[PDB]
Design a protein around this nucleic acid. Sequence first.
DNA 1: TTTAACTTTCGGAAATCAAATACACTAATATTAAAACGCGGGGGACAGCGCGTACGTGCGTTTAAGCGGTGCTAGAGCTGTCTACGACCAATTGAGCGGCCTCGGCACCATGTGACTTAT
Length: 97
Amino acid sequence: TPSELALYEIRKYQRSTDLLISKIPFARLVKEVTDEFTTKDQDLRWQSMAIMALQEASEAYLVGLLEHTNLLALHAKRITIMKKDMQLARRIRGQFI
DNA sequence: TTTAACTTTCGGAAATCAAATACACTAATATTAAAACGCGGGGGACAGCGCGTACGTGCGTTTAAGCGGTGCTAGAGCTGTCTACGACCAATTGAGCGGCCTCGGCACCATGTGACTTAT
C-alpha cells in the first residue's frame, strides 16, 4: 500500500522525538560555512555541542516552515509545494525573505 | 575546605502629607460628511473535464556515512602579577545678567578783588 506505508511513515517520524538530518554532512556543512565566513588568518573550532544546538534550531525551523508551506500548498487545493508557494509561505512569516 | 547568613549599621530611598494647578469628561449644538439602504452587474469563481505530467512510485548498482582505530595539538580555561583606568572629589574654572558706580555736566549760591567813591 503506497499511501498506507507513506502515511505510517509520516506518523512514525512525526512522533519520533529526535533530529533526522545526515550528520557528518551537516557537521562538514557548518564547518565549511564557518570557514568561508571566517577569513585568511582567524579560524574557529567547533565542539560537538555547538554543532548540536545549531542542528536542533535548523531542524525545528525547517519543520515549522514545512507545515506552513505544506499548508499554503493545501490552500492552493493541491498537495505539491512549489518554489513560489513555499517561497511566499516563508516570506509571509517574514524573516529571511 | 568555599558559598552563603547571620548580623551591626546607617543614610539615602520610599513612604507619607499637602495645594496647585489642570485636565477629562459629561454635554449642549446645528450642521453635514459620511453611512447605509437599495437595484443592476461584470466578473469572476467555481462546476466539470481532458490529458498531459511530475513527483512520486518501483528496481540496480553504486556511493558516502558511519564507524573504528591513530595521533597530536590547538586552543580551554587558568593563569599569578603588574598596572591603568575610571570612579570621586573639587577646584577650577566661567559667563551672563543684575548692581553699584562714577563719569561730567549741568543749575545754583559763595567768596574776593578791582573799580570808585565818599565821606572820610
